Amino acid sequence: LSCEVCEAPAERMCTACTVTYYCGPVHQKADWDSIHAKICQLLIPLRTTMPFYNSEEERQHGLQQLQRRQKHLIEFCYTVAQKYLFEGRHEDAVPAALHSLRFRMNVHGLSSVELVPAYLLLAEASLGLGRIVQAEEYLSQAQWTVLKSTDCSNATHSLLHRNLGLLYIAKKNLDEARYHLANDIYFASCAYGTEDIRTSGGYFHLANIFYGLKKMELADTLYTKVSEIWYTYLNSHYQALLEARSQQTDLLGKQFVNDTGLDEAQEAEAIRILTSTLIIQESTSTKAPQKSILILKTLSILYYLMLECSKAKEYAMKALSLAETYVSEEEQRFIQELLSVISAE
Amino acid sequence: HLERNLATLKKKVIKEGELHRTDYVRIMQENVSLIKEINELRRELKLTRSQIYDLESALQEETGR
Amino acid sequence: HLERNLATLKKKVIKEGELHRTDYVRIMQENVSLIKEINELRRELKLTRSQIYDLESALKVSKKQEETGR
Amino acid sequence: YDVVRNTQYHLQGHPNIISCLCVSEDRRWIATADEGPDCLIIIWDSFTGIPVHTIFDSCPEGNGMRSIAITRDSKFLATISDSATQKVCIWKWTLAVETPACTLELPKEYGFQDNLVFNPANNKELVSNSKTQAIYYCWFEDKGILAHSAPVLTEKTFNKLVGKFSQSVFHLKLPQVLSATKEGKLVVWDIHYPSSTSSSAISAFPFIKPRKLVHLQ
Ligand SMILES: [Zn+2]
Numbered sequence: 052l053s054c055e056v057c058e059a060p061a062e063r064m065c066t067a068c069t070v071t072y073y074c075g076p077v078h079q080k081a082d083w084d085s086i087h088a089k090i091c092q093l094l095i096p097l098r099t100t101m102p103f104y105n106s107e108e109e110r111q112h113g114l115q116q117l118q119r120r121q122k123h124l125i126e127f128c129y130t131v132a133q134k135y136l137f138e139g140r141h142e143d144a145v146p147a148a149l150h151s152l153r154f155r156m157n158v159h160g161l162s163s164v165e166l167v168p169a170y171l172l173l174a175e176a177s178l179g180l181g182r183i184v185q186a187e188e189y190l191s192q193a194q195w196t197v198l199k200s201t202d203c204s205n206a207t208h209s210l211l212h213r214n215l216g217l218l219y220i221a222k223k224n225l226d227e228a229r230y231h232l233a234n235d236i237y238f239a240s241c242a243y244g245t246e247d248i249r250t251s252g253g254y255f256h257l258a259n260i261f262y263g264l265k266k267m268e269l270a271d272t273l274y275t276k277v278s279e280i281w282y283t284y285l286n287s288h289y290q291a292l293l294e295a296r297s298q299q300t301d302l303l304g305k306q307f308v309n310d311t312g313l314d315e316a317q318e319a320e321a322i323r324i325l326t327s328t329l330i331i332q333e334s335t336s337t338k339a340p341q342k343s344i345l346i347l348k349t350l351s352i353l354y355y356l357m358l359e360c361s362k363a364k365e366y367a368m369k370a371l372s373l374a375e376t377y378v379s380e381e382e383q384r385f386i387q388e389l390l391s392v393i394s395a396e
Numbered sequence: 397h398l399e400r401n402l403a404t405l406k407k408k409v410i411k412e413g414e415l416h417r418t419d420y421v422r423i424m425q426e427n428v429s430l431i432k433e434i435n436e437l438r439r440e441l442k443l444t445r446s447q448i449y450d451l452e453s454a455l456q457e458e459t460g461r
Numbered sequence: 462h463l464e465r466n467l468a469t470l471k472k473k474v475i476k477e478g479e480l481h482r483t484d485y486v487r488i489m490q491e492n493v494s495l496i497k498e499i500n501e502l503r504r505e506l507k508l509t510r511s512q513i514y515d516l517e518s519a520l521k522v523s524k525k526q527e528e529t530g531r
Numbered sequence: 532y533d534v535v536r537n538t539q540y541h542l543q544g545h546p547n548i549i550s551c552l553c554v555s556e557d558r559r560w561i562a563t564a565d566e567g568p569d570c571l572i573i574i575w576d577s578f579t580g581i582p583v584h585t586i587f588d589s590c591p592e593g594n595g596m597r598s599i600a601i602t603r604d605s606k607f608l609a610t611i612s613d614s615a616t617q618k619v620c621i622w623k624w625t626l627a628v629e630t631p632a633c634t635l636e637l638p639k640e641y642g643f644q645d646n647l648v649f650n651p652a653n654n655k656e657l658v659s660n661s662k663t664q665a666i667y668y669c670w671f672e673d674k675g676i677l678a679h680s681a682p683v684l685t686e687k688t689f690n691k692l693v694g695k696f697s698q699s700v701f702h703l704k705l706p707q708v709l710s711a712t713k714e715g716k717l718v719v720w721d722i723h724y725p726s727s728t729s730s731s732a733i734s735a736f737p738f739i740k741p742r743k744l745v746h747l748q
């Protein structure tokens with residue numbers, strides 16, 4: 052046996068669960084935070100070896116429900132890992148990712164494409180740790196898998212190319228960074244369509260390269276494309292919510308749920324993208340403050356749909372003050388309406 | 397032969413149905429008995445808590461109107 | 462047509478009997494589950510009751526309008 | 532009536548004595564009926580306290596609605612008329628509807644039907660019983676059909692006394708209907724829904740089967 056979380060020794064028991072194994076206090080603490088704050092005990096129902104399911108239907112039922120629970124927690128762990136990578140908590144990401152990988156090994160087997168998402172998260176954490184060659188290990192595995200893969204979807208391959216690009220981005224060739232992110236953007240565009248937030252994430256990394264190249268007009272163009280995507284999606288939700296709340300009233304009445312419809316990890320990535328986009332859009336070209344107003348609107352909408360009320364208010368107030376000098380009344384009246392909705396809700 | 401076989405088979409099947417119904421209701425009666433016994437047991441716990449407190453202890457407004 | 466009568470009877474009744482026995486198994490699952498939890502109760506409760514009797518015996522030993530209407 | 536303020540609030544009359552009432556689960560809404568002729572079904576908002584809503588002229592002969600439930604879902608109201616043969620009708624009260632959406636009338640044999648309840652796990656299921664018969668209902672709005680079954684219990688089901696029963700209700704989690712008895716017993720039913728081969732035909736509307744009887748006190 053080993054410390055499953057790192058394959059160092061099982062130096063200590065997981066007193067929370069007995070089933071988890073730690074190389075003493077540092078990984079004990081980090082894995083406690085990472086998986087046990089999220090679910091802790093639920094792994095115990097996974098870890099327990101079954102008693103005899105006595106008939107074919109009992110075996111089938113027990114396997115099906117165990118496996119589907121395993122899958123559900125596999126995906127929740129992978130979402131948690133993604134959020135820890137977006138939150139920068141790469142230490143906490145390392146347990147969550149390694150667990151999700153090992154459970155994918157157990158259900159799917161090492162050969163599966165389903166590991167490729169986890170392998171790429173383990174690259175991403177390694178690059179958060181600067182362990183470039185370690186990330187190259189898991190990208191190597193993924194690359195062989197996908198090159199063999201009989202069925203790799205457009206989204207899956209977009210993931211591969213995106214992380215390949217990120218790995219070279221830690222490397223030193225901007226040409227490769229563009230080449231691979233471009234492939235990611237293509238495969239996102241054909242899977243999702245051209246206005247998806249994930250495509251925009253590709254465009255964002257491309258913009259950051261064009262900013263590093265100081266190719267201000269192309270970088271700003273990419274930042275515009277991304278900002279417009281985020282705007283359009285959040286507008287789609289915000290408009291639909293207000294329109295439905297307006298549309299009709301029986302005497303029963305109703306109230307609709309204020310909702311981002313996002314993954315919390317997608318919300319964290321939205322904040323990371325929009326914030327970096329705003330700062331780079333200003334520093335490349337303060338000559339277009341209206342694009343800052345657009346990003347402030349975008350974030351204020353996101354914050355309202357979250358009910359991140361404090362930043363929703365602050366960023367709406369900023370947008371309104373800038374829009375009064377810079378922009379037509381439509382901008383100001385939208386931002387006033389959004390503030391009135393935040394303050395009422 | 398073929399007919400006499402078919403007819404006797406159908407008769408056998410009908411009594412098989414009789415047996416199936418008989419056992420089904422027998423198990424239903426079992427389930428009833430178990431339910432009763434569960435209730436009895438759950439009730440029987442109720443008393444036990446009460447007394448121990450006594451050891452610790454040992455150590456017309458209508459007419460007003 | 463006689464052979465069709467045979468085939469229909471055989472298949473229908475075979476499925477009927479399989480259904481009825483598997484339903485008996487389904488109800489037997491509940492039967493066993495209840496019997497288990499019943500006997501768990503009966504043991505743990507009778508233990509508790511007896512130790513209550515012991516503790517109550519020890520407790521016993523160790524502890525040793527009308528005028529206004531008028 | 533408010534105990535602590537010690538003040539009454541009032542809902543203003545009917546053409547007859549009030550026969551039956553049910554309150555919405557949220558206690559926003561209160562519905563009421565009166566007996567006798569000319570009956571009106573009248574519904575109310577708790578927290579206006581001077582609300583109005585009404586169904587006029589619901590039944591010509593019908594001697595007022597002798598039991599009535601409202602959806603916890605709050606979309607529908609459903610009613611049982613006093614009449615020599617009783618009516619069952621469903622009402623889209625969220626609309627200003629003043630006529631039945633769907634209707635059925637039932638044999639006398641079931642008897643006075645005077646308990647009715649809505650299913651919190653459904654929008655298209657209701658239960659009702661008399662002293663002496665119990666009934667399951669489902670409404671197929673796309674068909675525009677309301678279907679009923681009222682099967683007859685007898686000693687044979689358990690070789691036991693069962694006698695008269697009072698109220699019936701939809702189970703917490705299972706495809707089941709409960710009935711409570713004067714006998715100290717509960718009765719439970721399961722519902723069976725059109726098997727796929729039936730779907731090509733009458734698809735005989737969901738049937739109720741008396742799976743179980745137990746004595747509780
Ligand atoms: Zn543990």
Ligand SMILES: [Zn+2]
Pocket residue numbers: 054057058059074078
């Ligand atoms: Zn370690």
